[PDB]
């Protein structure tokens, strides 16, 4: 029939094309009800605080606090030296340094060799 649409990571799958959207178990409905209940509880709490007339300040968000804490302060305590982490760190932290060192060293060696051989155009090169 019609050509199929292939989802990607940067072009996800639409809801209307999801196969699971048309196979709804009775347990799926109760899961959706529980999710809606959680959202409603959080919304009610936030709306009570938000419509409080005597509140002056910022409604602290534990979710935001958890996100900012897990992004910064919770990383090292849960870091373990594994082969994957070791190889990735070694590569991403050392390889670029040696690559750029080799590039600049080769370029400067060629330039200095040209200088010594006296066949590099250095006329008008006054500022350095």
């Amino acid at each position: 029939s019609f050509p199929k649409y292939k989802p990607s990571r940067l072009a996800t799958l639409p809801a209307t094309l999801d196969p699971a959207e048309y196979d709804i178990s009775p347990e799926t409905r109760k899961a959706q009800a529980e999710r809606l209940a959680i959202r409603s509880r959080l919304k009610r709490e936030y709306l009570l605080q938000y419509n409080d007339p005597n509140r002056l300040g910022v409604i602290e968000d534990p979710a935001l606090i958890r996100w900012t804490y897990a992004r910064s302060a919770n990383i090292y305590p849960n870091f373990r030296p594994t082969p994957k982490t070791s190889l990735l760190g070694a590569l991403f932290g050392i390889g670029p340094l040696f690559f750029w060192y080799y590039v600049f060293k080769t370029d400067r060696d060629k330039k200095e060799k040209l200088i010594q051989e006296g066949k590099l155009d250095q006329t008008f090169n006054i500022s350095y």
């Binding site: 340094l97 600049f104 090169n125 350095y128």
Partner: protein, 459 residues
Amino acid sequence: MLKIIIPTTMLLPMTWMSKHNMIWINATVHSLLISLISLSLLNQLGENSLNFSLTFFSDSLSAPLLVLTTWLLPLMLMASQSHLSKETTTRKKLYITMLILLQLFLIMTFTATELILFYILFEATLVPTLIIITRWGNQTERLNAGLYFLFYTLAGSLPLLVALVYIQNTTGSLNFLIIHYWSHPLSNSWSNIFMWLACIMAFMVKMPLYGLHLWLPKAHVEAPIAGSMVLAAVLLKLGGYGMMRITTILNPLTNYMAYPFLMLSMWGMIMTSSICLRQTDLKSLIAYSSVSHMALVIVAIMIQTPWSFMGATALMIAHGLTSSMLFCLANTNYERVHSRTMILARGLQTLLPLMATWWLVASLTNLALPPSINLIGELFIITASFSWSNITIILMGMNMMITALYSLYMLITTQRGKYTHHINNIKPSFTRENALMALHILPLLLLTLNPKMILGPLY
């Protein structure tokens, strides 16, 4: 230099003998007067330095740094009086005393004529800073930040002390004029390699170099506003000043020993800009931007050409002013909502217009926008690096693109969009905060008008 040194040692008893409600007024007025007095050091000679006495001298490199320090003190006083309203009189006076001692040590450091006195003073600068951080920081992490800062600096600087006493024993003097006139080439040996390493590593840790910089986000994020202002504006410039001073006796070993540091500086400049792109904390973003700019300054000092040193000096002055202003803006935002998260407060342009203007100007100066002295220094460094090699232009272009990206990302995140609905305690901007921003920004534009005052002795 005594006409500037003694008034600070007189700021001390004035602070301790003034009334309880007049400490801020007196300190601000007399700090501004001392800054005006120190403005007379900018009249420098084209041949040599200003040799006042056997102990102190001034140069085209020291003068702008001294003027910047003396100008930075009253702004720190304004911010401190902002955030220390409920403190006791004795503790307010102690905080002012710490700031005054730090300014005095910085002045004597920038004007010291011997390397050992310079070492003593630039290590003495640690105690007031550590006290300020670990005492008047707001969060728990101030203790760890102070430990990291202190131990990084000292583990860098102790081999510098050993090298300095060794150099004095070998050559007879540590006086800068004598070591400049009587300098001899450094032969390629392991001993000379390690002497070069001791000196350069001390000042690199002070810079900081990439890979030796974690203490900088730790201390800058967790220090109080005045501590953050002094850490970025002046205390990071001690490393650059020292490197521009010691490298007289480190030739020709600097041609061969500078490769790892140049590679670290360039790649870590790229990496810290990329880190700035993905920071959930505003203070951390400002700190990493400082790291990138000082990495560029390190590149300039390491390539070590007359065009690179002028760019290094201009970039140091510009970065000091811009980073101080950014920290002040972020601190006003923090004093509003009591949190450092960048995405917590939004719509601040529709809630506070003139602060949005200050944010815009600070961000435009943070990125190299012509004809600002930031761009002057960055362009001079880029031209010197281009003469050094022709792929440094690739690295510098990448860094400039990422710098603009993260600066405008910060601006758009904090100021644009729609305001947070539940944040209803954002009072209108104070005259004090507006004056702080104006005093941060106007001298930068005037320096743009007159650029030869911050281009160093190589001009």
